[PDB]
A and B are shown apart, each in its own frame.
Chain A
Amino acid sequence: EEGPQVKIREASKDNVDFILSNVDLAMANSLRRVMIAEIPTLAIDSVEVETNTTVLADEFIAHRLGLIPLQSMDIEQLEYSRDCFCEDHCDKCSVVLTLQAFGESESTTNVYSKDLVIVSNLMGRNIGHPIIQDKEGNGVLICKLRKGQELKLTCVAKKGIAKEHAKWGPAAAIEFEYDPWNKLKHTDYWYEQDSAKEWPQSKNCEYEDPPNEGDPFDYKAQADTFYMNVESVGSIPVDQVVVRGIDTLQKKVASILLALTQMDQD
């Protein structure tokens, strides 16, 4: 179009590999940052334990519950409970899950995220369904039970961002590399005999022309072209981690522009 340019190398349901060319390092990084910390997600933020006869502690369990990935597709159509006019929580700001599990067999009874059950009224939003990616369809072993063992609890899943708690991270690791040849001399390679022989070259070197020894150092050159790979945890699809990442950053810049307007009165 005009400014920044994208070339998707590879793409999957949970991973995008792309080259982000015609960009500022400030932008590429601020985008990397906002993908990690600020895209809103839905995660369990309250557990009420009715019964726990497991070997695991109340909070131990409640802690792992927050880490279970939940559908976050239609998240912007769910309010932050802090802005909701309800007393505490409701269907406009939260999702309610239920976990009832009992050791019926002599054999160890396993408790999975499949076993969480939405009780709340979703009002036709793709939200709160535990993210299941394992071949057996169980997804995430919450707990293990014996024979007389029982676990009865209620989950209030709420909107939030990684910046408040890592559980709200839609993404895992974000691969990031610019100038795989160090033509820019942005790093100084530590060596014994030969940096070149001692440092393994990036797969990214294929995508760029090598420095060429018989050329003086390009002092004026700036870092523009960024080899990235964004991994999704599941809650939101990969395309959405980057699109919402852009949109969030774009949004938080607009709030500054609007703040300047508001303080420009009296």
Chain B
Amino acid sequence: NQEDSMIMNQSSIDRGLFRSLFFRSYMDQEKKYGMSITETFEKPQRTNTLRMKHGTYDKLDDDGLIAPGVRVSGEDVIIGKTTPISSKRDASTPLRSTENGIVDQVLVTTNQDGLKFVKVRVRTTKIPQIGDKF
């Protein structure tokens, strides 16, 4: 506990001392321009595309969205989107390489421009660890 360190009681930590929830909202909208050239929310496969992240897309449903409840980590594709460049081209959103958690909530709504747009909230409990500031 010298030079501004502190000794925290692990017994008290186990009981809930300084435990916190962490949330992160990932966002995406279906295209910007082109009545013919419109992006799509979908779980994408081979279809000449191959521009994938991989980062497994395996946790996504048919709508290119992870169901709230699933555990996520590393570079798991949280939102699947494709760009039609002519076959498809990847536009999928991987989770932050550093982060991991549980899909908390997934809002499927529309923008003022009649755009299909989504928000993906991911929840992580953070327990007081070593170089954590207090």
Contacts and interface: CB of A to CB of B under 8 A. Distances in A.
Interface string A111-127: 00000000000000000
Main secondary structure of the interface of B (DSSP, over half): mixed
Contacts of B46: none
Contacts of B123: 57-58
Contact of A67 (B10, B15, B21, B125): B15
Nearest to B9: A166
Interface residues of A, number: 11
Nearest to B15: A166
Interface string A43-83: 00000000000000111100100010000000000000000
B11 interface: yes
Given A63-B16, A63-B19, A58 B11 contact: no
A52 to B, nearest CB: 9
Which of B15, B19, B123: most chain A CB closer than 10 A? B15
A57 B15 contact: no
Contacts of A67: 15-16
Contacts of B15: 67, 166-167
A165 interface: yes
B102 to A, nearest CB: 7
B21 A58 contact: no
Contacts of A57: 21, 123, 125
A59 B125 contact: yes
Contact of A58 (B16, B19, B102): B102
B61 interface: no
Interface of A: 57-60, 63, 67, 162, 165-167, 169
Given A58-B123, A166-B15, 19 more contacts: A57-B123, A57-B125, A58-B102, A59-B102, A59-B125, A60-B21, A60-B125, A63-B16, A63-B19, A63-B125, A67-B15, A67-B16, A165-B14, A166-B10, A166-B11, A166-B12, A166-B14, A167-B15, A169-B11
